[PDB]
Every structure is written in structure tokens, then in C-alpha cells.
């Protein structure tokens, strides 16, 4: 019995998507998969190059078909139909699309962990996942065959492993900016150790409630909630000074508009025009206040700046920090420059927050770059999010796990 599990992740350079690797099929093959933190399941391309002797269709009106979230039953191919075939709707969120999909079981194998190094390989003989057509791989990192869903369902990696191996329904995940080395996600229990000697545990992380959006943004089920991860930002501070925003937008409504969610599909943090204006203006305002000047706006970014008085620090460049103040005034997701800024070249630094129009379903969406080098723990059982802060502050990185 393993206490936990560890998969590698790595940043694809073209797309800025986070890519992970599990083992699937008999004989085992290594599958690259795009990480979708919000996703509802593992779905893999099931074309003629999917050869396995341990694949099984999941039948409708079976225990495993209810678990999947399958609302319908049965299939009509073309030239006739099939009675009950456990159809679902695998989603590519990069291209806002959903094709139809058939639930199935096959062998999945990953590495176990004691939380400090790579353990012996362990296996889920009948791991439940979704087939999909090659077309749902549109605009996904080269080499990948599907998408790793980490959302809040029974059959998505974290709860399905949790269930398979009988450990706590939780996973930490530590994204990196490197296309170079391996980052990691760790399914199961704490404490996570990052070389040389940096221990991260539930005693160490900051905890905010994990909130449930009662209506789904995931807009493909009637009166079915979002399986995504939203947290409760009360205000934004830019170096001790509250930015003037509509605080009503921060709160999730009756219809499921507004609020803050975390995602791994968005490489930079999407800000609604109202919040975007205020955050950007104030960030510029304060940056000039320590003699950091504005330069041309490089794509895809709003604000960009000279590296002339930009001092290098351990925590990034010497720019004001953005503090997202959560449920209390003493609980804050701090964002230093390593998490806010993005080097274009030697001489220009841009702010890594993009504008997302108006009438977007969610007011704030925390993105990949702002997640990079933070240990972020999702506890589904007790409905909370714990976070480490910039791991650079302790002189480690998300790429310092002893992975093999």
C-alpha cells in the first residue's frame, strides 16, 4: 500500500501548457497528457494506435457508469445504433470544445512516493477514463494523447487514486516554468520534500476555504455545479495599498458569475476589464513610485517596463508585490515578481496578467505563471486550499523534487 503518488509535469514551450506523464495499457505505454486542474476525467485519444489487451468498454447501467457522471446511455454510429454505451463529453478547454466520449477502463501505472523521492511503481488495473477523437487534441502540446483531469469528481485522478489506493482525497501540485527539468504533482498525503532539504507540510501551508460554484461555467447537465476550484479573494493589495474595485464582482452570485478560480489551462492570470483596469493602473502607479518606468506593451501583455532600476532579488525582480487578501486580513496569497513579471528579453519586463473582456463567467482566474514555483495543495475531503508561497523564498524550486 502506497501512502502517496508522484507524476512529472513539464512546460511545453510553444503553448505554455503544463504536460504530465502516466503509464497506461497492456503492454504499458508512456502517455503525455495536458494537465487540466479543473477537468472532470482522464480522457485519452482512442484511435487505431490505441492497442491494449486490458482495455474494457464500460457498459451503461453499471456501477462504473454512474460514477463517471454519465447522464445518458447508448450510441448511434453511422452507414444503426447501440443500446447503452455510457457516453460522456470530454472537453478541450484550450479550444472551448466538447466532443462525445465513451467511458472505459484500462491499466494505469505511476510511481509511489514517501513524499521525498520516487517510490516503487504501483497500478490501478481498471482505471476509469474517457475515449475521444483525435480532433479534441487541437491546439494541444506536441506529443500528447489526452488530458489529465484533476477536478472534483469520483473518476478524476485525485479522487480516483484516492479511492483506488485508500488514502486521503487530496493532491498537491507544484508547477514549474522550466521546459528543462521535471516538475511534479503529488497525489496522496503530505509532507512534500524539495531538495536540498525543504519540507512542506500542512503545518507549513496557508489555508483558505475551497468554495463551490453551485452553477457550472463548465457549460455543456442541468443544475449541476462546477467541479472547478474557486477561492475567496476579498481584496487586492499592491504593496500595502487596496486597489479600488467593484467588490461585488469578487463574490459568486446566484447565477454563478464572478469570483476567483485557479486554472492550469490559462498561462497568465485572466482579469476582467473592471479589475484589469484597476490592477494594471495601480501596478504601474506603484512601479513608477520606485522609479520603474513603462515601455511599449508587448503581446499578449498590457503593462511592460524597463529593467533599468529593476533590481534582481531572490524573490524575483524588485517590483511591488500583489497580495490577494483572502477570508481574513492575515491570510494572503502573496505574488512577488517571479510570479507577476515575465522577462521578454534582457531590457524589458512585462506584467503577466491578461485582460479577459467583460461578461466573462469568472472575475479573476489565477493562471499558470502565477502558480509556478508555489506548492498548491487541494484537499477535497475537507474542502480547503493550502499554499506555500513562492518556494524561491526558501531557496528551492518546484523542479527540486528527487524524481526518478
Amino acid at each position: 500500500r502506497p501512502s502517496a503518488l508522484v507524476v512529472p509535469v513539464k512546460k511545453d514551450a510553444s503553448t505554455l501548457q503544463y504536460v504530465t506523464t502516466i503509464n497506461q495499457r497492456t503492454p504499458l505505454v508512456s502517455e503525455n497528457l495536458v494537465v487540466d486542474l479543473g477537468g472532470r476525467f482522464l480522457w485519452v485519444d482512442c484511435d487505431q494506435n490505441y492497442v491494449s489487451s486490458t482495455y474494457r468498454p464500460v457498459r451503461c447501467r453499471t456501477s462504473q457508469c454512474s460514477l463517471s457522471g454519465s447522464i445518458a446511455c447508448g450510441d448511434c454510429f453511422n452507414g444503426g445504433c447501440n443500446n447503452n454505451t455510457c457516453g460522456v463529453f470530454p472537453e478541450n478547454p484550450v479550444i472551448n470544445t466538447a466532443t462525445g466520449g465513451e467511458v472505459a477502463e484500462d491499466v494505469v501505472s505511476v510511481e509511489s512516493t514517501d513524499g521525498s523521492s520516487s517510490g516503487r511503481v504501483v497500478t490501478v488495473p481498471r482505471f476509469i477514463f474517457s475515449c475521444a477523437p483525435t480532433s479534441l487534441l487541437q491546439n494541444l502540446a506536441s506529443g500528447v494523447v489526452g488530458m489529465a483531469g484533476l477536478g472534483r469528481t469520483r473518476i478524476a485522478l485525485p479522487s480516483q487514486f484516492a479511492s483506488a489506493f485508500s488514502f486521503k482525497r487530496k493532491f498537491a501540485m507544484c508547477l514549474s516554468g522550466s521546459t528543462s527539468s521535471n516538475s511534479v504533482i503529488i497525489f496522496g498525503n503530505d509532507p512534500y520534500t524539495f531538495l536540498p532539504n525543504i519540507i512542506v507540510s500542512d503545518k507549513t501551508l496557508t489555508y483558505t476555504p475551497l468554495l463551490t460554484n453551485p452553477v457550472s461555467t463548465s457549460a455543456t447537465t442541468q443544475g449541476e455545479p462546477s467541479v472547478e476550484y474557486f477561492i475567496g479573494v476579498k481584496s487586492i493589495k499592491i504593496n500595502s495599498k487596496i486597489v479600488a474595485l467593484n467588490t461585488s464582482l469578487l463574490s459568486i452570485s446566484s447565477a454563478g458569475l464572478g469570483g476567483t478560480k485557479i486554472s492550469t489551462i490559462n498561462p497568465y492570470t485572466v482579469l476582467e476589464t473592471s479589475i484589469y483596469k484597476a490592477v494594471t493602473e495601480a501596478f504601474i502607479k506603484e512601479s513608477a513610485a520606485r522609479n520603474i518606468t513603462r515601455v511599449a506593451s508587448v503581446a499578449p501583455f498590457g503593462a511592460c517596463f524597463s529593467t533599468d532600476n529593476i533590481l534582481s532579488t531572490r524573490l524575483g525582480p524588485s517590483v511591488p508585490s500583489i497580495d490577494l487578501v483572502l477570508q481574513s486580513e492575515s491570510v494572503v496569497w502573496t505574488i512577488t515578481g517571479s510570479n507577476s513579471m515575465v522577462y521578454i528579453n534582457d531590457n524589458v519586463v512585462c506584467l503577466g496578467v491578461v485582460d479577459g473582456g467583460s461578461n466573462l463567467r469568472t472575475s479573476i482566474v489565477i493562471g499558470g505563471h502565477q502558480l509556478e514555483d508555489n506548492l498548491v495543495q487541494f484537499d477535497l475531503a475537507t474542502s480547503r486550499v493550502g499554499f506555500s508561497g513562492t518556494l524561491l523564498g526558501s531557496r528551492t524550486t518546484c523542479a527540486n523534487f528527487n524524481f526518478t
Binding site: 520606485r290 533590481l311 534582481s312 531572490r314 523542479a399
Partner: protein, 218 residues
């Protein structure tokens, strides 16, 4: 005889010398460290490196660290220190600092980090709330600039020299005593770590030659 591994180490007298390339994943390049001379509470060494990429991200913290027992500030009479070094190489962005840590137990994770920067080269700078000095003290025969900032659940206090100090000598305890008297650090806290090292970001054909370094706890 040197070492070039990410976690390669060396023990010499009172010290452990650390290559500690913790941010090598943030950039492209090389770093090699080695002992030149040691005896007891004194050491000599060098780290040659070239790093490019990640102009924001620290690639390593090559440091010599003293081996001692966690000790309360109110028991420390003096921490005598001598440091002489030289840096060759082009486009060097890096610092050279004493680096220490204060906990409330002789074991618990740290509450204060206190640094004394003998050099800030090519853009290097300390953690800061405002970006401005909180004091400009004169301590141990050097005019310093003091900054302060949050790091997780740790206040970081950094004393930076007004100009690059290739030769330094004095009582490092003074820096603690000053913080205890002027910034409300508890004299009861344990000193857990004492490290003198260099953190580079980017540069070419660099070499930090530490010609002598010596530190003690009395």
C-alpha cells in the same frame, strides 16, 4: 580538487562548503566549487561559474557554513568574523553576503532571516516592502543600508554595504544586537545558521576568490 554537482559538498574544519545549485533549473550554465585552504575556524575557497537565462532567478547559493549548536542571542558575547574575497568576470550580477536565521526553538522553522551583504553587483538586491531603506546604520566600521521584507512566515532583514567591501572584519553579533534594540527582535531567539556565500543570477567567466574567511561564536 573541486566539485560541480548540484548538491555536491565538502567538509573542511569548522565548515561545510556547499555548491547548492538550487536554481540551476532556472537558467543555462555551469558552476564549480573548491577548497583551497582550511584550518579550524578559517577557510579559503572559490566558485567559478557562468550563468545565463533567468535574469530574475537565483541559480545557486554557494556558501561556507559553520557547524555549531543553535544558541540563544542573550548567551552570545561575540561572533568575530573576517572576510576577504575578490570577484573576476564579466556582466556579474550576484551578491556576497553573510546569511543567518533565528528560530524560537532550536529546531522549528525560521522566524527572522538576517543578511549582511558585503557586495551587490550588477543589479543584485535584497527583499523589500517599499524598496527603501528602513535605516542607514553604521556598524562594525561600515556604513550599511538596512532593508526589510516578508518571506513566508519570516521577516527578512538585510544590511547592504554602501560600497563593495572586498575586505571586512568585526563582530557579527553587533548586527543582531542592533536589530534586538531597534527592530524588536527577541533576545531569546535561537541563532540556528551562519553562512557566508554568494548568490549569482547571470554572468560570464566568473570567479569568486575568497582569499580568507573566518568566523566564531563566543
Amino acid at each position: 580538487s573541486d566539485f560541480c554537482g548540484q548538491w555536491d559538498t565538502a567538509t573542511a574544519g569548522d565548515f561545510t562548503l556547499y555548491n547548492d545549485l538550487w536554481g540551476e533549473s532556472a537558467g543555462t550554465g555551469s558552476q564549480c566549487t573548491g577548497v583551497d585552504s582550511y584550518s579550524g575556524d578559517t577557510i579559503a575557497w572559490h566558485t567559478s561559474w557562468s550563468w545565463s537565462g533567468g535574469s530574475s532567478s537565483v541559480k545557486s547559493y554557494v556558501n561556507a557554513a559553520l557547524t555549531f549548536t543553535p544558541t540563544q542571542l542573550n548567551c552570545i558575547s561575540s561572533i568575530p568574523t573576517t572576510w576577504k574575497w575578490s570577484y573576476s568576470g564579466s556582466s556579474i550580477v550576484a551578491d556576497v553576503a553573510y546569511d543567518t536565521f533565528l528560530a524560537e526553538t532550536a529546531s522549528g522553522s525560521s522566524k527572522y532571516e538576517i543578511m549582511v551583504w558585503l557586495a551587490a553587483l550588477g543589479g543584485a538586491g535584497p527583499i523589500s516592502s517599499t524598496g527603501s531603506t528602513i535605516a542607514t546604520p553604521t556598524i562594525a566600521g561600515v556604513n550599511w543600508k538596512l532593508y526589510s521584507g516578508p518571506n513566508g512566515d519570516t521577516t527578512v532583514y538585510s544590511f547592504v554595504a554602501d560600497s563593495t567591501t572586498e575586505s571586512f572584519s568585526g563582530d557579527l553579533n553587533d548586527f543582531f544586537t542592533y536589530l534586538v534594540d531597534n527592530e524588536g527582535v527577541s533576545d531569546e531567539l535561537y541563532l540556528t545558521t551562519l553562512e557566508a556565500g554568494t548568490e549569482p543570477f547571470t554572468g560570464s567567466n566568473a570567479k569568486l576568490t575568497v582569499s580568507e574567511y573566518s568566523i566564531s561564536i563566543e
